Amino acid sequence: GSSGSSGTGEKPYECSDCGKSFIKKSQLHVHQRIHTGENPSGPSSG
């Protein structure tokens, strides 16, 4: 019912597109991908 992500000390490589963070660069690189190609959704994009 009342529960969710339970992790202390957020992880590095924090995605500057949605929020998803990662420990290794590669992990983020593979992700950021989805955040590239189409129009920049949300005003939080330059």
Residue 24's contacts (CB-CB under 8 Å, 6 or more residues apart) are 13
Alpha-carbon distances, residue 7 vs 1, 17, 19, 24, 29 (angstroms) = 18, 20, 14, 17, 22
Query: Site for Zn ion (CB under 5 A): which residue of 18, 21, 22, 27?
Result: 18
**Which of 11, 12, 15, 42 contacts Zn ion by CB under 5 A?**
15
In contact, 17 and 35? CB cutoff 8 Å: yes
Number of residues that bind Zn ion (CB under 5 A): 4
21 touches Zn ion (CB under 5 A): no
Minimum CB distance to Zn ion, residue 6 (Å): 21
Which positions touch Zn ion (CB under 5 A)?
15, 17-18, 20
